[PDB]
């Protein structure tokens, strides 16, 4: 309503292991966000890129984690 952006651009992912009562990987948890955190990574480094960490700490963080 008034000037609008209906279309946007970003990723499409799916979901991770979980239908179940097993523990997570820290290197394998919130995998979305582990994919984003390691690109950056591979782009720079993760010092340049702890807001890609940060985001991803904290999704782990929501399983029971130790972040
Ligand atoms: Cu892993």
Request: a neutral charge; one cysteine or more; proline letters at 10%.
């Amino acid at each position: 309503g008034s000037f609008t952006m209906p279309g946007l651009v970003d990723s499409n992912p799916a979901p991770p292991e979980s239908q179940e009562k097993k523990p997570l990987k820290p290197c394998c948890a919130c995998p979305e966000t582990k994919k984003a955190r390691d690109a950056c990574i591979i782009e720079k480094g993760e010092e340049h890129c702890g807001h890609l960490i940060e985001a991803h700490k904290e999704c782990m963080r929501a399983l029971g984690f130790k972040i």
